[PDB]
Structure 1
């Protein structure tokens, strides 16, 4: 069958994809582009209304001396200009980050122990359901005890709620099912058994605060807002004095002792509180993506939906705005989720490993790293040499280095079943690519890459960590595009090949298996296309409270 990127290269350019020569300078610059033309007209209107010049296509250099390309969102049939994949212009991308930032997992294990042992009251599925009805009134910002409370408008905070889950099926089935993430409904049988074994009799809340509050405030608001309304609802549903000494044990339990943030806080040079992108470890990002429970027959699809999730959040929103800003990093990320390119390269490496070793049957050692990552790196690089249209599409070296190395590192981990040798294959890929083409990425691209081989298996203080525990604050990874979302894919790859239900935290995996989320985490690239087409409906808007 044709390479998977051929259809996209035929849509982008008039020439055959193997053709070495073309025509430039004859497309009318920005006038060739529907989107640039919309932008020139809107810049005219904005500058006239506000009295200060703004977008002007004649400032600086003239875009579109070459073809301004459409991009196929991989796994879809949707082709859009890249501006429609900028996170500012894509409501699905903004909502995917708001749905992670506004979530927290909060145990009820210590809380139920405080009720039984300190208050001397019984907990049963019925008392849990009455508490859940209470907290689903209170969590969006409504009152349960005081007189003369003023409250949030229920339709502005309709995305906020609390659900629960537990590994004990018979307790799960006794709580009212409007509040329950049903593990047996959302997961295939074998994964459901794994996840229920991990949770056991534990009972956990998934709390989502309003997107309008997350956007007004920050990620570190989420566990506080959750705990305030858990606390009010424990007062009201279990009949406490409204503020007695035991009230503080529910606060310490919900804010510290049984809270699971999505992200940990960051050091001062990049100061941020919890639930910001830099604190989300790669293994959690793989677990938040829900492709594992739907596409489990196809480890490549699961791994590359995690790469899309990560490349957008970590390169476009985190590195391209929280840590920089401006026009930002759209195409450093799109290279990993468009045109079916990374898909073509990773399917080749999965087939290569199937033939030679069998999935997860290779020895977990350097001989496998040298064999698989070198083979896959040369396959990917040969594609850019065989197809000039492919090289002009992924025109930046960093984009090619991330795509080739992701295929090589995911294929190495499909062979060994272990993410650490996948990670060594990613670094070898970069060294081979740099010598093959006498170039790699942007000025600073291979800071982590040259530290990389030596730090894969180090055990020292701020060097040694299994890849699943690493994240955007692992020291060597804290600055640069074209790595973090691909590492989240490498972290998913051996667990998708093994058929494991989760990569690093089973509670995070369950917490996003929920169709009451605004973004559909089971189909991340489908949602990115929907937002690019201006068809996604985000939460958090202010239309109800502003002029018609």
Structure 2
């Protein structure tokens, strides 16, 4: 039974061999014989488009012949990529707002690096936009103020009218005033509002078009856990237009919903224009009873709520919906598969924090640092290493996932074996060593596979992530090289900070994030931690890792991005088959 990177489980594709058309175990290659960028369909097409652009605007742009010392890019193979594990999927074939239904089990192979660049991939951009345009609030206080101050009864009928009105004004219309401007419905068709509740009788009394159905979206055991936390309360989940956050930031969401929800309360309950109660609605939405995807950031990297930088790792873990899919519930031979949850949750975890945030907010440029991150969700490499650690631990400790005692010693044992297996394959397959040519890719992958195995096997997220940092000596003392110049800042320091309680060192992994100082600057890490946190919770029988409200809030088929199968969605964007929201086609000239 070969490694998954040499033979995918069901399609039997050889992901590494397909890059070269040569046995990846052979240490031999011919260089300078590919015609440079001519071997790339996307860069060749880009060159021809660039010539037209230069002629039209009068300023040169993309020009591959500018490559240093006459050496065009492409002196070696510009490898293509295969999305990991698409041939092992069997569910999620429903049509989505972004594309017709994917046929589960169909692979996406031959993608070029530029197809998985955040700048060129609308699925990756929409993934982030869906997170930041979301506003979540408890409605108890607004209903309390209406009943106690205003004097009107709140019933399923008034809640339904409130949601019909909020869905009319959140993106397009006006209700109370004469002569008022409105937005073109075509530009905001992705904007809407819903609610969820732990009260099954209330859920059954509402118009289901406005309901996030916990009983439908989740398996029984997970629905029971979430409903027990939500209790007899109503939570609103509103998504403002993607186009609106694209003209500003995610901090607009709570303010925007503050305006529209206040108006829908005024109109659904006939409250006079200017009544003092109005201020309680906006205060409740913006501050009184609110859940944010991201918290504010300090002056150097100043941000209001809902920027990728303020999103706690556990919130990135819980907005992923792989935890409620059949693949994650019975993929490990009829049993729960926490590894499927880790490897999927780390895909937006890596792409959003590294490409969406570190790159598209803190640094930038035309590359999107794409090849660094592509390596974590393609060709079954990290997949093979992760499953290797799980199978090893299940056989050694004779138990299931989440049941290996969470001792420091067991963490070290598993980490040593996964590091060994990662190094064994990079050493025995020159073609794989060349595919993941950057040391950071190889270093992050052995550290992530080790953490995934420890997290999935012990159910302990801090211990799972401790295994990541222990890979620093294991990697360094073997190869005598690690990653890029500033890659091991956090790895070195977290070998000590993981179980430290000093002021800015101690903090559970669920609540760490891109503002934890050690993690604020470098790629190839945060996404891995995000996957580990999600998998550790999954392995110990939990429905989420950090916030049940976030988990329920993203169980929604009306989301533009499919949060259940992110690796697949990023591949669909790679095929140019993902239609994002926010485009301004309705009000611009033809093209």
Q: TM-score band (shorter)?
A: over 0.9
**What corresponds to 1:22 in structure 2?**
29
Tell me, in whole angstroms, the C-alpha distance in 2 between the residues paired with 1:415 and 1:339: 24
**Structure 1 counterpart SS, 2:178:** coil
Compute the displacement of 1:141 (Å). Answer: 3.7
Moved over 4 A (4+): none
Q: Which residue does 1:124 correspond to in 2?
A: 155
2:340 aligns to what?
Answer: 301
Counterpart secondary structure, 2:174: coil
Q: Secondary structure at the match of 2:188?
A: coil
Q: Give the counterpart of 2:76 among 52, 66, 73.
A: 66
Q: Are the counterparts in 1 of residues 403 and 540 from structure 2 also a CA contact under 8 Å?
A: no
Match of 1:380 in 2: 422
| Residue 360 (structure 1) shift | 2.1
Identify the match of residue 378 of structure 2 among 331, 335, 338: 338
Shift of the alpha carbon at 1:334?
A: 0.8
Does structure 2 retain, via aligned residues, the 8 Å contact 1:303–1:496?
no
Give 1:53-452 correspondences, 5 Å limit.
Answer: 53-61=60-68, 62-76=72-86, 77-79=107-109, 80-294=111-325, 295-296=328-329, 297-326=336-365, 327-357=367-397, 358=399, 359-452=401-494
Which segments of 5 or more consecutive residues in structure 2 lack a partner in the other structure? Answer: 7-13, 87-106, 330-335
User: Shift in Å at residue 355 of structure 1?
Assistant: 1.1
TM-score in terms of structure 1 length: 0.99
* Counterpart pick for 1:488 among 519, 530, 554: 530
Within the candidate set 32, 54, 61, 1:47 is matched to 54
1:387-433 deviation digits (Å, cap 9, x = unpaired): 11111001101111111111101111222211111111110012210
What secondary structure is seen at the aligned counterpart in 2 of 1:162? strand
Find the aligned partners of 1:3 and 1:356 in 2 and give their Cα distance.
20
SS at match of 1:254: helix
Report the Cα offset of residue 361 of structure 1: 2.2
The Cα offsets for residues 441-474 of structure 1, whole Å up to 9 and x where unpaired, read as 1110011111111110111221111111111111
The superposition leaves residues 300-357 of structure 1 with CA deviations (integer Å, 9 ceiling, x where unpaired) of 1111000111111111111122111012311111111111111111010111111122
Alignment of 1:527-538 (within 5 A): 527-538=569-580
Quick one: distance in 1 between partners of 2:17 and 2:53? 37
* Cα displacement (A) at 1:260: 0.8
Paired position in structure 1 for 2:99: none
Q: Normalising by the residue count of structure 2, what TM-score does the alignment of the two structures yield?
A: 0.92
Shift of 1:364: 1.7
Aligned-partner SS, 2:196: strand
Name the counterpart of 2:4. 4
* C-alpha distance in structure 1 between counterparts of 2:586 and 2:456, whole Å: 50
Distance 2:16 2:67 in 1: 29
**Per-residue deviation, 1:115:** 1.2
CA distance in 1, matches of 2:159, 2:266: 13
Contact kept in structure 2, 1:455 and 1:464, CA below 8 Å: yes
Partners of 1:328 and 1:546 in 2: CA distance: 28
Deviation at 1:434, TM superposition (A): 1.0
3-state SS of the aligned residue for 2:467?
helix
Paired residues of 1:70 and 1:81 also in contact (CA < 8 A): yes
Q: Identify which range, 260-269 or 352-361, moves more after superposition.
A: 352-361
| 3-state DSSP of counterpart to 2:232 | coil
Query: Cα distance, 1:127 vs. partner?
Result: 1.1
Q: Distance in 2 between matches of 1:117 and 1:41?
A: 68
- CA deviation digits over 1:372-395, x for unaligned, max 9? 111111111111001111110011
- The answer to whether 1:515 aligns with 2:557 is yes
- For 2:372 and 2:183, the matched residues in 1 are separated by 40
Alignment deviations for residues 122-176 of structure 1 (CA, whole Å, 9 cap, x no partner): 1111111111111111111411111110100111111100000000111111011
Instruction: Kindly state the Cα deviation for residue 362 of structure 1 after the two structures are TM-superposed.
Output: 2.1
TM-fit CA distance, 1:489 = 0.9
| 1:181 CA displacement | 0.6
Render the CA deviation track for 1:267-322: whole Å, top value 9, x for unaligned: 11111221111111111111111100002232111110001111111111111221
Q: Distance in 1 between matches of 2:15 and 2:24?
A: 10
Residue 204 (structure 1) shift: 0.4
CA offsets per residue over residues 58-107 of structure 1, 9 Å max, x none? 11331000000001111232120010000111111111111111111111
Task: Give the deviation of 1:499 after TM superposition.
Answer: 2.5
Conservation of the 8 A alpha-carbon contact between 2:476 and 2:482:
yes
Q: Deviations over 1:5-27 (max 9, x none)?
A: 11111110122010011111111
Offset from partner CA, 1:224-279 (integer Å, 9 cap, x none):
00110000011000111112111111111111011111111111111122111111
Kept in 2, the 8 Å contact 1:15–1:22? The answer is no
Cα distance in structure 1, aligned partners of 2:457 and 2:242: 41
Give how far 1:202 is off: 1.3
